[PDB]
Design a protein around this ligand. Structure first.
Ligand SMILES: *[C@@H]1O[C@H](CO)[C@@H](O[C@@H]2O[C@H](CO)[C@@H](O[C@@H]3O[C@H](CO[C@H]4O[C@H](CO[C@H]5O[C@H](CO)[C@@H](O)[C@H](O)[C@@H]5O[C@H]5O[C@H](CO)[C@@H](O)[C@H](O)[C@@H]5O)[C@@H](O)[C@H](O)[C@@H]4O)[C@@H](O)[C@H](O[C@H]4O[C@H](CO)[C@@H](O)[C@H](O)[C@@H]4O[C@H]4O[C@H](CO)[C@@H](O)[C@H](O)[C@@H]4O[C@H]4O[C@H](CO)[C@@H](O)[C@H](O)[C@@H]4O)[C@@H]3O)[C@H](O)[C@H]2NC(C)=O)[C@H](O)[C@H]1NC(C)=O
Ligand SMILES: *[C@@H]1O[C@H](CO)[C@@H](O[C@@H]2O[C@H](CO)[C@@H](O[C@@H]3O[C@H](CO)[C@@H](O)[C@H](O[C@H]4O[C@H](CO)[C@@H](O)[C@H](O)[C@@H]4O)[C@@H]3O)[C@H](O)[C@H]2NC(C)=O)[C@H](O)[C@H]1NC(C)=O
Ligand SMILES: *[C@@H]1O[C@H](CO)[C@@H](O[C@@H]2O[C@H](CO)[C@@H](O[C@@H]3O[C@H](CO)[C@@H](O)[C@H](O)[C@@H]3O)[C@H](O)[C@H]2NC(C)=O)[C@H](O)[C@H]1NC(C)=O
Lengths: 51, 126, 52, 110
């Protein structure tokens, strides 16, 4: 997940084509991350160690 | 138990600016959002803005886009709101609140969990 | 922009002159960019001039 | 439209059914189930009665209750008492990382 509520900003760059970018960040600034269940990872790494 | 004991009431006339400070005790200061809400004398209730006491990031009601700027001093445990360009319509009994807990992983700022409040100050723009 | 104590995950707010659809005319516009895609430009010391 | 819409004042005798409703737009109460209600007596705090549409925090008597239906969230009422004679405000999620409050209320238990 990326929690930040980003905004789409468009910029005309040359005749008839648009460059895109992020505008203001809405809300509070937060950290992107990914979660894993601990015991499932322990079980996976233990079963992989068995082999 | 928990309290967010505000300052005393102080007033200036319309066109000037004023101040209110928002203390906290005994719980830690840097861990919950601090919210400011307004309750006008012959009206319902309003919202000023939310304060992130850790980083200082803030957002405010678009009615008060430039009129209000929020700040804090974590060592003291106090937060400041200063309302400018005053009018008689900016009379209220001003309240200060601890909002929700602060996580690094998701935005709890806009949660209206106005749990514990300040003891109130009667700012009649006189 | 800067934040101290704890941690901060911010990105830069960088402006740049753009050639609008009229080749004669240019306008100031801005965009937010993550740090990895932004590098300082000059080999000489300058704290504000950056490059993609 | 000053903030969320609310009745100006509501009333009812003990044993009678009441709902003090609060209504917002699609940029509002519809999305996140973020609404709460307050209990303000004169010269006191707006005591904290309902949050997350239905839940009641500790210190609340479980007569009080709430609900959501799309664009509105209704304060659900039972067993009226002289303490229930009070304001009943309303504040919710408003878009662009804000909240938006309600016009208030006054109950008069009959
Ligand atoms: C990926 O994975 C990550 C994690 O790995 C995941 O992130 C997680 O998401 C969870 C889901 O949201 C999130 O859960 C929330 O956690 C909140 C915090 O709870 C912890 O911290 C507090 C700290 O307490 C302070 O303060 C008290 C005093 O109040 C004090 O006693 C404590 O000691 C401590 O003191 C501080 O100050 C001291 C000063 O001296 C100092 O000494 C101390 O060191 C400290 O600095 C603990 O108390 C808790 O027990 C936890 O340990 C938690 O509050 C929150 O619950 C609330 O919000 C929920 C919705 O978000 C509600 O459903 C729920 O009911 C709770 O609502 C109550 O609380 C809010 C405040 O948020 C309040 O405004 C409400 O009105 C409501 O009040 C009622 O209950 C409270 C009890 O809370 C009563 O006291 C009142 O009277 C009312 O009755 C969530 O549970 C989790 O934190 C987060 N993980 C991390 C690491 O951040 C992420 O989501 C994953 N990614 C994806 C995509 O899923
Ligand atoms: C995440 O970011 C998005 C934006 O990328 C953000 O959504 C935006 O929220 C604003 C509200 O703050 C929306 O603005 C609306 O615009 C319409 C015009 O089409 C107006 O009618 C709306 O105002 C009415 O409602 C008000 C109450 O909310 C009344 O007080 C008022 O009188 C009007 O009757 C309102 O201004 C905007 O359209 C969205 N945009 C998008 C793309 O969603 C979102 O809130 C941010 N936060 C979260 C948690 O998602
Ligand atoms: C990123 O940087 C740009 C500028 O480098 C920021 O845009 C600028 O934002 C300010 C504040 O809103 C604008 O100034 C204000 O304009 C209003 C007019 O209504 C005026 O009343 C105020 O006194 C103030 O001057 C300014 O115009 C604007 N500049 C441009 C070119 O749009 C932007 O906010 C920054 N974003 C972030 C996330 O840091």
């Amino acid at each position: 997940t990326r929690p930040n509520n980003n905004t789409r900003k468009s910029v005309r760059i040359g005749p008839g084509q648009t460059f895109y970018a992020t505008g203001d960040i809405i809300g509070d600034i937060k950290q992107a991350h990914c979660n894993i269940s601990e015991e499932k990872w322990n079980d996976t790494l233990q079963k992989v160690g068995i082999e | 138990e928990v309290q967010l004991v505000q300052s005393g009431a102080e007033m200036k006339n319309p066109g000037a600016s004023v101040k209110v400070s928002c203390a906290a005790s005994g719980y830690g200061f840097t861990d919950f959002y601090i919210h400011w809400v307004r309750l006008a004398p012959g009206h319902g209730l309003q919202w000023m803005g939310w304060m992130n006491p850790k980083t200082g990031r803030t957002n405010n009601a678009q009615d008060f886009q430039g009129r209000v700027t929020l700040t804090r001093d974590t060592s003291i445990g106090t937060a400041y709101m200063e309302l400018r360009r005053l009018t008689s319509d900016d009379t209220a009994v001003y309240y200060c609140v601890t909002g929700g807990w602060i996580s690094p992983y998701y935005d709890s700022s806009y949660y209206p969990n106005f749990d514990h409040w300040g003891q109130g100050t009667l700012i009649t723009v006189s | 922009a800067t934040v101290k104590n704890g941690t901060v995950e911010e990105m830069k707010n960088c402006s740049f002159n753009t050639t609008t659809e009229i080749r004669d005319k240019e306008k100031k516009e801005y965009a937010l960019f993550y740090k990895p895609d932004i590098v300082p430009l000059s080999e000489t010391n300058n704290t504000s001039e950056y490059r993609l | 439209q000053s903030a969320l819409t609310q009745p100006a004042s509501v009333s009812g005798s003990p044993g009678q059914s009441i709902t003090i409703s609060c209504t917002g737009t699609s940029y509002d109460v519809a999305k996140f189930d973020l609404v709460s209600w307050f209990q303000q007596h004169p010269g006191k705090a707006p005591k904290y009665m309902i949050y997350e549409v239905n839940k009641w925090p500790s210190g609340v008597s479980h007569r009080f209750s709430g609900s959501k239906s799309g664009n509105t969230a209704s304060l659900t009422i039972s067993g009226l008492q002289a303490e229930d004679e009070a304001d009943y405000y309303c504040c919710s999620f408003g878009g662009s990382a804000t909240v938006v409050c309600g016009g208030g209320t006054k109950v008069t238990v009959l």
